[PDB]
Amino acid sequence: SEAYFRVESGALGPEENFLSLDDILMSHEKLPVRTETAMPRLGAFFNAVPQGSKLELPLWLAKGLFDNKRRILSVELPKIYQEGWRTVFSADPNVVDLHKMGPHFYGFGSQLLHFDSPENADISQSLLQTFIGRFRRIMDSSQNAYNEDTSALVARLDEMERGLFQTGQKGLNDFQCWEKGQASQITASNLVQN
Amino acid sequence: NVLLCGDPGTAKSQFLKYIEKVSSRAIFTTGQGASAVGLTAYVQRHPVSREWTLEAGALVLADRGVCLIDEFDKMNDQDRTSIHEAMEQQSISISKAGIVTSLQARCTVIAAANPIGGRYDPSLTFSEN
Amino acid sequence: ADEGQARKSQLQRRFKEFLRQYRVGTDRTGFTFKYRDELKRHYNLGEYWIEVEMEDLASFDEDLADYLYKQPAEHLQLLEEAAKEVADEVTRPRPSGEEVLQDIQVMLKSDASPSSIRSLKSDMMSHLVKIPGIIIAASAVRAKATRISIQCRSCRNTLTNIAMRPGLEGYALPRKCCPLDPYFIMPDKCKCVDFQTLKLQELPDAVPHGEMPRHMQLYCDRYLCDKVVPGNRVTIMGIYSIKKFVGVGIRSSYIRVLGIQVDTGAVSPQEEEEFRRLAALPNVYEVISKSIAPSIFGGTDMKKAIACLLFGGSRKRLPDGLTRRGDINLLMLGDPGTAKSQLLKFVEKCSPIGVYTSGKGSSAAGLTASVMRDPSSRNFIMEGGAMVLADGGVVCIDEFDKMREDDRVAIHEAMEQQTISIAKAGITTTLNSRCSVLAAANSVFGRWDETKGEDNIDFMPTILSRFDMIFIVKDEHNEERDVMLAKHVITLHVSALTQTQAVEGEIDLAKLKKFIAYCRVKCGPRLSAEAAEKLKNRYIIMRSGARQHERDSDRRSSIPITVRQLEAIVRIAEALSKMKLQPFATEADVEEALRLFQVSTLDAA
Amino acid sequence: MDAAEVEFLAEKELVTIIPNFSLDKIYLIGGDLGPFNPGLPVEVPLWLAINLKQRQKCRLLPPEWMDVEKLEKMRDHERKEETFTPMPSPYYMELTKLLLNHASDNIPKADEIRTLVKDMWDTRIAKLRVSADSFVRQQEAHAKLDNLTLMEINTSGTFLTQALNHMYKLRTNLQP
Amino acid sequence: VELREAQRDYLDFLDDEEDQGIYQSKVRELISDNQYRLIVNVNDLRRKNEKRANRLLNNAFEELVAFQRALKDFVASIDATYAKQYEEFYVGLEGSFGSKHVSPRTLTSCFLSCVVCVEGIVTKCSLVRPKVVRSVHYCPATKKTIERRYSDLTTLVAFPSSSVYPTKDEENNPLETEYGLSVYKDHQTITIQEMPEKAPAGQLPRSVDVILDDDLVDKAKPGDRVQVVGTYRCLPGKKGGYTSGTFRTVLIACNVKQMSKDIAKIKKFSKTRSKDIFDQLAKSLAPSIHGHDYVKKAILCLLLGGVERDLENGSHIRGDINILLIGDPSVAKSQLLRYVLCTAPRAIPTTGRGSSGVGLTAAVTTDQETGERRLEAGAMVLADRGVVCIDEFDKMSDMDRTAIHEVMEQGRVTIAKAGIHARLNARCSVLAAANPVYGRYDQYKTPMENIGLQDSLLSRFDLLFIMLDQMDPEQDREISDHVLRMHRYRAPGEQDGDAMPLGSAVDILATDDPNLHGTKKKKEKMVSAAFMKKYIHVAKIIKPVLTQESATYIAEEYSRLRSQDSMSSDTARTSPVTARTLETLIRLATAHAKARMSKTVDLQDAEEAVELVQYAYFKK
Amino acid sequence: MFCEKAMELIRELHRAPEGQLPAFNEDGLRQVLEEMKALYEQNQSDVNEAKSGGRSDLIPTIKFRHCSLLRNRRCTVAYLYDRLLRIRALRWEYGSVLPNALRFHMAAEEMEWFNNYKRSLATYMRSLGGDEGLDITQDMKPPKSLYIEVRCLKDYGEFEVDDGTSVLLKKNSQHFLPRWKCEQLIRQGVLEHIL
Ligand SMILES: Nc1ncnc2c1ncn2[C@@H]1O[C@H](COP(=O)(O)OP(=O)(O)NP(=O)(O)O)[C@@H](O)[C@H]1O
Ligand SMILES: Nc1ncnc2c1ncn2[C@@H]1O[C@H](COP(=O)(O)OP(=O)(O)NP(=O)(O)O)[C@@H](O)[C@H]1O
Ligand SMILES: Nc1ncnc2c1ncn2[C@@H]1O[C@H](COP(=O)(O)OP(=O)(O)NP(=O)(O)O)[C@@H](O)[C@H]1O
Ligand SMILES: [Mg+2]
Ligand SMILES: [Mg+2]
Ligand SMILES: [Mg+2]
Ligand SMILES: [Zn+2]
């Protein structure tokens, strides 16, 4: 029915959604870079920022400054997307804590491909295989954790996987309410709290 | 709880002995003969196991009887202050040698004492002597 | 015998049909197959256990419930096998890597009134028993074989998948294949489960007068391992039985546990909604303060301090690895007969983890930790004192002034650093003591004597600095307060018969306990920037006042004012915010923290 | 789509009732019904059947497939097969819930019928779980689910479709 | 019968000559180094054969004997004679093991027969003893030699052989043992304990027994934080004709890594780029603690240390620096100790009331592998070539400080207990913290009465600092600002309203995956903690030497300090200046030279060292 | 970094997934607009300096401030639009006249948008048929019964059932009425559907 629905996240696509709060928060996360030419007047922030300076700045700003000729700055991957952590994911995707390793792991990784790194293919394959490995546990936990504390199950999941978990939980709760007949009652909305 | 204060030769100890005889589960102790640890509870190496074990003191052995403390003024302070928890909260809480537990001490304490200098002087209040 | 196998198969089929057919609900609303769905969801989650209620089994088939009560050792095996096959037909087909079926542990519980340890006479042997108690010791998890394979040592023939009896009883190896003892047990080709022995002390309410508390050995199996820790209060459902490896025909007894019920952390969503509503309503602080020790007239600021202690601040690990304690330490010096001991006895009951100790009844080793020789192994082992037993909770040290100085010295590391560093008997470790110390004490001269001033306190400055808040709760005589207090006391004594009814504008003790646990695990606040600025300025003014008072007296004050007091105000404000589940402490939260600390600082003027 | 809406579609299925009232043919927009003669069977949509049973105006008759022998055969066939088997009705779970919750008195051996329908439901949801896992593991582009019912698809399909959208975008993010 | 397929898989994996040559190169390195276990990365095994990697981690014993036989075949193909020179070639596994990364607490019974990587702290070790694997015997009556292999439940094949040797009858003739032709392997048992901070709430740390064989026996001592990769197994404790189901469990280790022990060119460039890098390091020492600059410099000197001299006459001059902090409540003494415990390699915590003279030095304990009693090292012996932090030092018993006296004075401790009479090495720097008598420092009493310790003990400390809770308003302003800033801080990898989680295991690879200034602030370019750890680890080794100018200035200023004591106030002098103070001056100058990585103690080092001594001796 | 004040608007809305409407962050909106004004003034000064003086090194920082400005715009527009989504859900979940405790959270322009949306929605609903349109806001759940039993939660005024017939909605009184007449009051919480 006509319930409130957030603007959906478009982080996994070629470009993120403009009005998505999730995409905005995802792109806020910082990204290491190396500056290719000195920038005047910005020494107050990191008077000129000298050439060759290492910086960590937001992903939206890195994408804004980044032109494919690599004229202003060079963009480097975060550690969690480099080969060692990709190997960690290859070991067993179920045990890594993607909530602590950036809450928007898949969205940040997908937008990290925009900079045309030589290991873009490796990053993409790592993201795909991580999702494939974690899918079954997400599915079973979401669809079988009925009416209990879901904190331990949902703790290690990134925000995309948390959305999938809530979708599965919503389906489970809907079917259980149907089977026990509670779905037939007409009830006041959540706004009765006011 | 009762406290019998007064001068010598007034049958206070005799009253305590009578209460010992009439009442079941009664015990009697005196002054320096008592100790803090013996009054409340004591931790010992068990004789055959040699592991630490908690054991009942006076106020735990009289857990639903009367503990009689004669010549109460003449105890040591460390011995005398040990009965505070037993006298009001009616438990004896022990945290020793790995034992952390509280025993029941639902005991009525009846005590006898002399004032300062032995003889009670009516010129002073009870708290003053 | 075929007749015996027929009996076992029939009983297994009856248990199977119980698990297949049992329902709860009504036709007016709907039905859910309780144990079918529990089996399916637990197996899909990888839990491989269920919890069959004896009352439900009795309602479905009373004969099965009676058989399981009288002869649980025989029939629980059949019930577990029935649950295994029901899980198979309920869950299959299963994806790749889940083809092999797993064994199911059928725990069970009951609504019946429990028995007691001293009620366990000889006639209760091999029956189901339900007793309460307190766990005082807990073994490390060890592996017990459920099925073994034995290979002949000489000719290398093998006997495989020999079923081991459950519990602490063992199995006799055959003496025929070769030597008199032909066999060894193959360490690879055997299947083992976790097991854990516990010691269950009799409840202090249940000890008869003058007796020491008895204790009973427990055997926990598979998923019952680590379901309970020392200090917890439980109801244990199990099988009273002999161990089966002074006097001759004697056998030691123990309870094979098959159901654990914590009598009082996984909250239900309904309880979480209640806790969120409690955090959301505007007067939750006053509601909590009224809920703390409702039988105690007055002392509202001290109750508020106890609320801040119960909820506690937020632990913080800084970039250099140094950790700041979130726990709040609260001392209550003052006059006798002023409900200090009763407030401690309430906090012990109310805190999610709570340990009550008498200062005079304590020792340095018993408070922090003890090193003792293990009798069965000759090694020196560690034993948790009160501050380790209360880790993640509150220590209530009553009559705190009666401790010897060397024993009060022992808790200095645990009060501030929240660790107990030990170097004794060749074992060297750093235990955790993340706990709050709530202390009660009387004045040096019994009552607080205002003419003598700082001489009323014998505690050192070093230990006084470690207390976040220090109350000098003086008993001030006043006829109006005395009349109202006496009326309250007499009505309280009259109210010992009126069904223990609840009160408006108050949280039940159990609900308050669970709410404290929820807020503790969930919310860690911080200070807002302007609030921190306010606290900074007020700290400078306070320190200047303390310095000038000390200069005017030409004597150092007993109670100091230090950076610990600043951080104490910080964590008090964080506790106030954590009551409301707010990520930040506002200027009003810092104002209430300053007000409470000002009450505790007028008490140091 | 909600389970109540799947029940709403399931309520269109035709069932037979024995009225205890007299009423001539009524011309409904979805199709005329009746005449309703006392004591004689008449076929009506399930919503009207449940409404009349609630109002004590008829006795419901079970469908031909609500039979313990037939349901046991269907259950054993479902457990024996790997693919979803053809079900007796396209809304069998909802039919079972409505008819047994409202007319257990009329329908004999309703406990056995309910338990067998639950067995079939558990088996087929397990098959759907296996199908979803195989889909994601093998990175299939499409699946074939011929004999699934609408309630079975609705129970797990929102999660599965969202997960497959995420998987598709993850495996296609190297398009240039 | 089926393991030839697994052996073929492992031999195919090892023969890396076709594609990358990694593991043929590693086997070649093994041959050249004369070693007999190959270190294999299961990540590479995953990349080449995921199926075999999963089988290896879940079916460990059969897969490992297959892998070892494949390794023996491969090393025979590379070098046959070297393959004959060893009984069998082992394989130790490193890399990422997925869910098998466990602690001693989480290592439950479901992990049996699996490869598991256990992280923890070593509590004890048994003595190394040989273990027979194959004994060779000779028959003089027959001029013939025979052999017998031996196995027990610990071995991978796990059959229990008879313990005794063939003795008086083979061919009904007497045999005798050829010990030289027989082969024995080293055997050791250690106990790995859970990390104490990671236990849940009131639970004490749990532990698991570990068995080391052959070349692994040296690689762990008590106090080490290690990661042990091995196979988890139960040992049936049969009585003979009967057993209880209760079996003890052990971890047969195949690899051990020291996870806390452990490029220099960038350090040697940074010491040139930075100006007086000692000051920057000292300021960046404990960022959370404001002020106490000279104390931080002294702690950095303690961390770096002097150089221990051996004289031609055989006497030695102790190189460690000992620091005693005395001060009021709440002046960060305990926090400075905690920072040193976190930053330094092999820093042992200790507190005055919670320790004993026995536990500080050594205790007689029964080794349950045999029943014989041996010395188990105490705190200061564990701290050898390290630091020991003693909080509440004024609360120790005198009999307990008798132990500390020898350790500080001579760098040893003498023990005479059980069957052993020995001088144990206890060469450690002591960083002690104490409160003055009466809790708070009294300005109206002499320092020797505020300080309750005996003058004999105080002579053993290089530097003694008195630090006071002086309630100056400006100092209070800056301190409170820093404290509230620290309490306001939250980590970037944490949500805006999180309470920090209680400890749980979070290490999921045998080697660290993410492989110099702080970025937030402008003032003075604070150094990061990791770089400081690495720099101190490098700079401790430099070993600089005195110069004529620095020696002359140290001697002149020491003479000034001594002559200044003639008219200095006896009522307020912190400690009497003596030759011990001169030793302190030399050690501090050497430590400053180590900080600069200079290789020559210069006049700058002498100036800073004697400034520090002047402050410590004649300033509050 | 510049953007953090804009991120507080975003974090405010993201911290309430349930769809309830927080108070309008007027001060935060003023601050981010002031920041954009300052950024634009600096950018204009720098860009005209660079172009007039022929100085080329300014162009990276020009792009820096330009991207920062576009970021500020994206954040505030997303904030306003998500607030519009939350407001739009109120017409369907509760009804037309919002309670004053919630109406106090809305901006005046938000009430303007909401009134325009209500007028547009009512116009669309009227235009669906020849006379009286179709009230698609009703029939939110599938219908089960023609009549329902309802219980009055709020002490409330007279409620017309049909013309001269009406029912007094006094608290705890219980009526049996048509579902389509009672649906709006149940959704508003005046009535409780039972059974
Ligand atoms: N009123 C009395 N009637 C009978 N005997 C009495 C009375 N007063 C004292 N006595 C006797 O006095 C003797 C001493 O009694 P005792 O109980 O020891 O006195 P007390 O109060 O304890 N004096 P003291 O021990 O010095 O404090 C006993 O033989 C009593 O019987
Ligand atoms: N304000 C109060 N309201 C209710 N009961 C009170 C109050 N003050 C004292 N009491 C009662 O007085 C008795 C003694 O209380 P208690 O808890 O021992 O206070 P206390 O100050 O700790 N005593 P002490 O150990 O000598 O300092 C108990 O029965 C209390 O309930
Ligand atoms: N200069 C400071 N900067 C930051 N925090 C400080 C400072 N001085 C004290 N503190 C804080 O004060 C608290 C107590 O520190 P602590 O190290 O125990 O003091 P201490 O000198 O050891 N006093 P004590 O343990 O009573 O002898 C800690 O939380 C410190 O972080
Ligand atoms: Mg007498
Ligand atoms: Mg008390
Ligand atoms: Mg300290
Ligand atoms: Zn045999």
mmCIF file of N, CA and C in Angstrom, chain A residues 105-135:
data_model
loop_
_atom_site.group_PDB
_atom_site.id
_atom_site.type_symbol
_atom_site.label_atom_id
_atom_site.label_comp_id
_atom_site.label_asym_id
_atom_site.label_seq_id
_atom_site.Cartn_x
_atom_site.Cartn_y
_atom_site.Cartn_z
ATOM 1 N N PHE A 105 29.868 -1.708 2.012
ATOM 2 C CA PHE A 105 30.989 -2.412 1.392
ATOM 3 C C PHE A 105 30.784 -2.573 -0.110
ATOM 4 N N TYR A 106 29.639 -3.130 -0.513
ATOM 5 C CA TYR A 106 29.413 -3.399 -1.930
ATOM 6 C C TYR A 106 29.239 -2.109 -2.721
ATOM 7 N N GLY A 107 28.515 -1.138 -2.163
ATOM 8 C CA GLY A 107 28.325 0.120 -2.865
ATOM 9 C C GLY A 107 29.621 0.887 -3.047
ATOM 10 N N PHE A 108 30.429 0.969 -1.987
ATOM 11 C CA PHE A 108 31.722 1.638 -2.088
ATOM 12 C C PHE A 108 32.635 0.911 -3.067
ATOM 13 N N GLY A 109 32.638 -0.424 -3.022
ATOM 14 C CA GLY A 109 33.472 -1.179 -3.944
ATOM 15 C C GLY A 109 33.057 -0.999 -5.391
ATOM 16 N N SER A 110 31.748 -0.944 -5.645
ATOM 17 C CA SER A 110 31.268 -0.762 -7.012
ATOM 18 C C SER A 110 31.642 0.613 -7.551
ATOM 19 N N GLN A 111 31.459 1.660 -6.744
ATOM 20 C CA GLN A 111 31.846 2.999 -7.175
ATOM 21 C C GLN A 111 33.360 3.158 -7.242
ATOM 22 N N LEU A 112 34.108 2.319 -6.521
ATOM 23 C CA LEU A 112 35.564 2.352 -6.615
ATOM 24 C C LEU A 112 36.055 1.942 -8.001
ATOM 25 N N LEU A 113 35.233 1.221 -8.770
ATOM 26 C CA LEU A 113 35.586 0.843 -10.135
ATOM 27 C C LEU A 113 35.586 2.021 -11.103
ATOM 28 N N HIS A 114 35.014 3.167 -10.721
ATOM 29 C CA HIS A 114 34.920 4.298 -11.641
ATOM 30 C C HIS A 114 36.290 4.855 -12.011
ATOM 31 N N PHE A 115 37.289 4.685 -11.145
ATOM 32 C CA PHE A 115 38.598 5.289 -11.354
ATOM 33 C C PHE A 115 39.480 4.510 -12.325
ATOM 34 N N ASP A 116 39.020 3.365 -12.835
ATOM 35 C CA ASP A 116 39.720 2.631 -13.890
ATOM 36 C C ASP A 116 41.066 2.105 -13.395
ATOM 37 N N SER A 117 41.057 1.524 -12.200
ATOM 38 C CA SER A 117 42.259 0.902 -11.676
ATOM 39 C C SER A 117 42.598 -0.340 -12.507
ATOM 40 N N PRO A 118 43.881 -0.717 -12.607
ATOM 41 C CA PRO A 118 44.215 -1.926 -13.383
ATOM 42 C C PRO A 118 43.617 -3.206 -12.823
ATOM 43 N N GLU A 119 43.298 -3.249 -11.526
ATOM 44 C CA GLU A 119 42.687 -4.407 -10.884
ATOM 45 C C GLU A 119 41.187 -4.219 -10.669
ATOM 46 N N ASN A 120 40.520 -3.518 -11.593
ATOM 47 C CA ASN A 120 39.066 -3.391 -11.531
ATOM 48 C C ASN A 120 38.388 -4.749 -11.657
ATOM 49 N N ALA A 121 38.892 -5.601 -12.553
ATOM 50 C CA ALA A 121 38.302 -6.922 -12.737
ATOM 51 C C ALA A 121 38.408 -7.754 -11.467
ATOM 52 N N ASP A 122 39.556 -7.683 -10.790
ATOM 53 C CA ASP A 122 39.730 -8.422 -9.545
ATOM 54 C C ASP A 122 38.779 -7.916 -8.468
ATOM 55 N N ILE A 123 38.597 -6.595 -8.379
ATOM 56 C CA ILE A 123 37.672 -6.028 -7.398
ATOM 57 C C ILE A 123 36.252 -6.505 -7.678
ATOM 58 N N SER A 124 35.846 -6.466 -8.950
ATOM 59 C CA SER A 124 34.492 -6.874 -9.311
ATOM 60 C C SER A 124 34.259 -8.346 -9.000
ATOM 61 N N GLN A 125 35.225 -9.200 -9.349
ATOM 62 C CA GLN A 125 35.078 -10.623 -9.073
ATOM 63 C C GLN A 125 35.054 -10.890 -7.575
ATOM 64 N N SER A 126 35.857 -10.153 -6.803
ATOM 65 C CA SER A 126 35.845 -10.325 -5.356
ATOM 66 C C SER A 126 34.497 -9.941 -4.763
ATOM 67 N N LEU A 127 33.919 -8.825 -5.218
ATOM 68 C CA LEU A 127 32.602 -8.427 -4.723
ATOM 69 C C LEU A 127 31.547 -9.471 -5.069
ATOM 70 N N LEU A 128 31.565 -9.962 -6.313
ATOM 71 C CA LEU A 128 30.580 -10.950 -6.740
ATOM 72 C C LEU A 128 30.702 -12.237 -5.931
ATOM 73 N N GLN A 129 31.930 -12.729 -5.750
ATOM 74 C CA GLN A 129 32.115 -13.977 -5.021
ATOM 75 C C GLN A 129 31.822 -13.809 -3.537
ATOM 76 N N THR A 130 32.104 -12.634 -2.968
ATOM 77 C CA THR A 130 31.745 -12.378 -1.577
ATOM 78 C C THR A 130 30.234 -12.434 -1.393
ATOM 79 N N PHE A 131 29.489 -11.796 -2.302
ATOM 80 C CA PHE A 131 28.034 -11.840 -2.203
ATOM 81 C C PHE A 131 27.511 -13.262 -2.375
ATOM 82 N N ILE A 132 28.083 -14.013 -3.321
ATOM 83 C CA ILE A 132 27.645 -15.391 -3.543
ATOM 84 C C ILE A 132 27.909 -16.237 -2.302
ATOM 85 N N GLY A 133 29.073 -16.058 -1.677
ATOM 86 C CA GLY A 133 29.384 -16.828 -0.485
ATOM 87 C C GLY A 133 28.479 -16.493 0.685
ATOM 88 N N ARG A 134 28.174 -15.207 0.872
ATOM 89 C CA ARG A 134 27.365 -14.790 2.011
ATOM 90 C C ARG A 134 25.864 -14.940 1.782
ATOM 91 N N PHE A 135 25.422 -15.225 0.550
ATOM 92 C CA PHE A 135 23.990 -15.228 0.252
ATOM 93 C C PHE A 135 23.235 -16.284 1.053
#
